[PDB]
Amino acid sequence: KKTTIEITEQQQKAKVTEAEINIQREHYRVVAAEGSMLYFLVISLSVM
DSSP, rough: OOOHHHHHHHHHHHHHHHHHHHHHHHHHHHHHHHHHHHHHHHHHHHOO
């Protein structure tokens, strides 16, 4: 009875942590996207 209640709580926490990360993914989307876009430019520079 104790384990079953503790598992259901961990499933609720997992969904909450996933939702939190998914909001932070969008906040740092612009930071990373810039990082990525810059890297590919640096690879073009190597070729010339």
